[PDB]
Design a protein around this ligand. Structure first.
Ligand SMILES: CC(=O)N[C@@H]1[C@@H](O)[C@H](O)[C@@H](CO)O[C@H]1O
Ligand SMILES: *[C@@H]1O[C@H](CO)[C@@H](O)[C@H](O)[C@H]1NC(C)=O
Lengths: 107, 104, 227, 109
């Protein structure tokens, strides 16, 4: 139920980094975009190699055991209605989401 | 608010509140806000799946204000042991029903 | 010629931890006792007696004798004798007092709705039942600070009509209706010898009581196997 | 509620407040004829902690738990001089505590 709201801004040339708590458990760490139309959550990147088809090659992830932190970095942002992204751990996405954020690509 | 029965085994959470109502006299309201989260598809014996499907769901507001229960906690773990042939010798091996909750 | 000996009370060993045998002698013409003494079956002496009272308005003198004893000097099953002397009887008068159980139950009862409709003062009550022996102390605490005894009263314990071994009593506190509208801690603290910690508080507020409007919001899904 | 869960015998409390003269009388009427004096116990009148010259009292009736679900009255009658008719009485039953409307929601998706 935590709300670590962050208001990073990013254009097409702008790159946006999202900070997530890393429990170091290493079973699964992921970011999940909540789907406004369906009313549920939709994974974008995880510990697994899968990635969104529209987002292929544009988003990467960094693990920091030294600081126990997880980085989701997006190099290019194509005016997405950047909804709410939830960091989470574990296979079950809805039950494993820890923190949620939302920002704005425009300004 | 007043609901110190957040026991996540039977899911209950029946809190109490007082409608700071429209500013008339103490014509107030007392509530009991239940939210039971039925697993419904879980198994009878919570630590052993060989038990049949748990159909009945009993809910007494006495024992849930603290036992067999229905769901899994993130802070606790439930495990199991399994055999295998691999030919002749059968060796017990330990598995965990709750991954990302008690993974070694 | 009035001579009496009174034992200590639980309301003093919990409030101040000051168990002490008292010996009150009054109505004697010249002097109640020129020398107070307290003796025991094993022949153990006692401490000093002081705080002597002035003569009564009815042409007689009052005297008191103190036997400051240990806490276990009354729960070990032994007797106490108050040696008192006068001037007309050549024999030193003697008097003896000694000591002879079930756990109580405490119940909070909410003020009746009718007096809440009148808006002067609701009376909260805590009933203590089934205690043996009749050795219960009751006090009222608000927000962790006790209230003055002038605000609440406690009933002298009476024997149960059906269970003579058991005893029952109660205490009541009057509070302004508006205060109970806003609400307070309202703790009835109870102290009986048949209690683990000597302690069994129960409390009440506007939040608790008879619920007049529920609303259950139980949910169903099909994967919350992990509440 | 907690007394009713012991499933043994319940206690009715009858409280009288604010009367100036002492020596009030309390009797327990059971929908018709009275009851034996040993089925109820009344206390003495003590002064009011709040009021200067007013008193109060309290009486207890002990009944079996099962008698409530039967649905009997067990009314309390009191007599005192200051009453307009020198006598009054009240009553209470399990049907007095139940009045409450519920409220239920039940989603399943
Ligand atoms: C039905 C339910 O779950 N909750 C209801 C709520 O919708 C309603 O606004 C309120 C008003 O009395 O009563 C309760
Ligand atoms: C329960 O009642 C309160 C106030 O009456 C209301 O705010 C709340 O939404 C209700 N809950 C449900 C599940 O209807």
């Amino acid at each position: 139920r935590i709300l670590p709201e962050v208001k990073v801004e990013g254009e097409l040339g702008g790159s946006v980094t999202i900070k997530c708590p890393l429990p170091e458990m290493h079973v699964r760490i992921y970011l999940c975009r909540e789907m406004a139309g369906s009313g549920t959550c939709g994974t974008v990147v995880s510990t697994t190699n899968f990635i969104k088809a529209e987002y292929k090659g544009r988003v990467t992830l960094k693990q920091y055991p030294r600081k126990n932190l997880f980085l989701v970095e997006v190099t290019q942002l194509t005016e997405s209605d950047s909804g709410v992204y939830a960091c989470g751990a574990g296979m079950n996405t809805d039950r494993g989401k820890t923190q949620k954020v939302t920002l704005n690509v425009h300004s | 608010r007043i609901v110190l029965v957040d026991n996540k085994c039977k899911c209950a959470r029946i809190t109490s509140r007082i409608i700071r109502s429209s500013e008339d006299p103490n014509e107030d309201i007392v509530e009991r806000n239940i939210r039971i989260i039925v697993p419904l598809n879980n198994r009878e014996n919570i630590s052993d799946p060989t038990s049949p499907l748990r159909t009945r769901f009993v809910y007494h507001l006495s024992d849930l204000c603290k036992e067999t229960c229905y769901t899994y906690d993130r802070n606790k773990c439930y495990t199991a042991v399994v055999p295998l042939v691999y030919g002749g010798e059968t060796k017990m091996v330990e598995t965990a029903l709750t991954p990302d909750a008690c993974y070694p | 010629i009035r001579v009496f000996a009174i034992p200590p009370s639980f309301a003093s060993i919990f409030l101040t931890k000051s168990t002490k045998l008292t010996c009150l002698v009054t109505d004697l013409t010249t002097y109640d006792s020129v020398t107070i003494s307290w003796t025991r079956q094993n022949g153990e002496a006692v401490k000093t007696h002081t705080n002597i009272s002035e003569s009564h308005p009815n042409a007689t003198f009052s005297a008191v004798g103190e036997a400051s004893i240990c806490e276990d000097d009354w729960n070990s099953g032994e007797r106490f004798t108050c040696t008192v002397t006068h001037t007309d009887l050549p024999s030193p008068l003697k008097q003896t007092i000694s000591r002879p159980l079930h756990r109580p139950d405490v119940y909070l009862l909410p003020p009746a709705r009718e007096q809440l409709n009148l808006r002067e003062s609701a009376t909260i009550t805590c009933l203590v039942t089934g205690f043996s022996p009749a050795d219960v102390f009751v006090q009222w605490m608000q927000r962790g600070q006790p209230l003055s005894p002038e605000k609440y009263v406690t009933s002298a314990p009476m024997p149960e009509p059906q269970a003579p071994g058991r005893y029952f009593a109660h205490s009541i506190l009057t509070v302004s209706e508006e205060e109970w509208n806003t609400g307070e801690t309202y703790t009835c603290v109870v102290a009986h010898e048949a209690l683990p910690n000597r302690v069994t508080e129960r409390t009440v507020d506007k939040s608790t009581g008879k619920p007049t409007l529920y609303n259950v919001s139980l949910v169903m899904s099909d994967t919350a196997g992990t509440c």
